[PDB]
């Protein structure tokens, strides 16, 4: 059972991933996907979110009162607040897999430049934080990341998203030849040892050519 | 302008493309975003797009004719095309920079353990092709790392126009007994730039050494 709480000046920037979910784990009460607007929590009637940052510079900055405010409203001791951002830690599978079993994600999404520094350094007094970056590019604002980072963990968790180092070398499926091109005859031989044997090399020449900082 | 085409079984998960910065580029014109779903070109009954592995293993991989049907379509010599994957080069920054300058990119959205190899081996005797990682985690497709692509991309085209920003502030300069820094209120630029630049790179010492050639985690 898990529940993620998304707070956002876009709610509608996480709709299909709420209708993303089986009806089946929903009903099962296994997954919760909640999306807030922050102006819900604005103090006046231009409902202001950020404002310009101190000390000079480009772009503006998240105002703290109003995601202190939905943070307090949202937020309990159990939660995990997650908060996507250039500046982040790196997330990756590690991540995915121990938020998988956490009973409540709580992800703040801001503009690039930033929430104010305040919120987290608060939040983190009564609960856990973890500021995150889902890659080395820079997004305008954590919504896209959001949806990454919802994906990522609930395909880990059961029966929620519907789904059953190196990399992962070439697939193939029918016909054997397509446009010129066969299927690797090794893949067709019923010689199952030497097939994990040839894909080991596969993955080995490929985590050499792309990712060789895996090495 | 630049033209984006996606394909996807899944065209509805594109739809946050119409919000915030994608969805300011297109109403500005300076982007055409067009969401394509990959059974357009199927022909059977129950529209296929796959079938299971040569060589054994879990799951289901995409067919080839579908997808060679659909790239002839909407893939000239001049597209770049780009296939999201866990087991792609890494898409980093000075990629994004690089693609903002392209007439046209093709995003083909793969699902379940993939897209038969020859669909790329294919294109790439036509046009130029980029299989891209997103980041270090697995997806259940790649919709998800299309729109952190167009996200990452269109925010550098002109006309919308290293080391981790560290904390920033607002007002007020007090909140809940907490403090903003003093230099930053002190309005000495240089001491605020070199607090800023130092704040910099402690930040990712902490949060990211590889970036300063330093072990991780």
């Given at each position: 059972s898990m529940k993620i709480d998304?707070?956002?000046?876009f709610p509608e920037?996480?709709?299909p991933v709420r209708q993303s979910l089986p009806g089946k784990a929903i009903d099962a009460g296994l997954v919760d996907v909640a999306v807030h607007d922050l102006r819900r929590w604005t103090h006046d009637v231009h409902k202001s979110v950020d404002d310009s940052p101190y000390g000079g510079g480009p772009g503006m900055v998240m105002k703290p009162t109003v995601w202190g405010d939905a943070l307090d409203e949202?937020?309990?001791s159990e939660t995990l607040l997650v908060v996507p951002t250039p500046a982040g830690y790196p997330f990756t599978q590690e991540t995915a897999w121990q938020w998988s079993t956490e009973d409540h994600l709580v992800i703040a999404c801001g503009r690039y430049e930033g929430i104010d520094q305040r919120v987290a350094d608060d939040a983190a007094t009564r609960m856990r934080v973890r500021e995150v970056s889902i890659g080395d590019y820079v997004l305008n604002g954590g919504e896209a990341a959001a949806l990454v980072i919802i994906e990522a963990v609930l395909r880990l968790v059961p029966g929620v998203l519907?789904?059953?180092?190196?990399?992962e070398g070439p697939s193939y499926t029918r016909p054997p030849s397509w446009r010129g091109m066969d299927v690797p005859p090794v893949l067709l031989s019923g010689d199952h040892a030497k097939i994990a044997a040839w894909?080991?090399?596969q993955s080995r020449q490929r985590t050499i050519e792309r990712r060789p900082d895996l090495l």
């Open positions: 998304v707070v956002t000046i920037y996480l709709q949202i937020c309990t519907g789904n059953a180092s190196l990399l894909r080991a090399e």
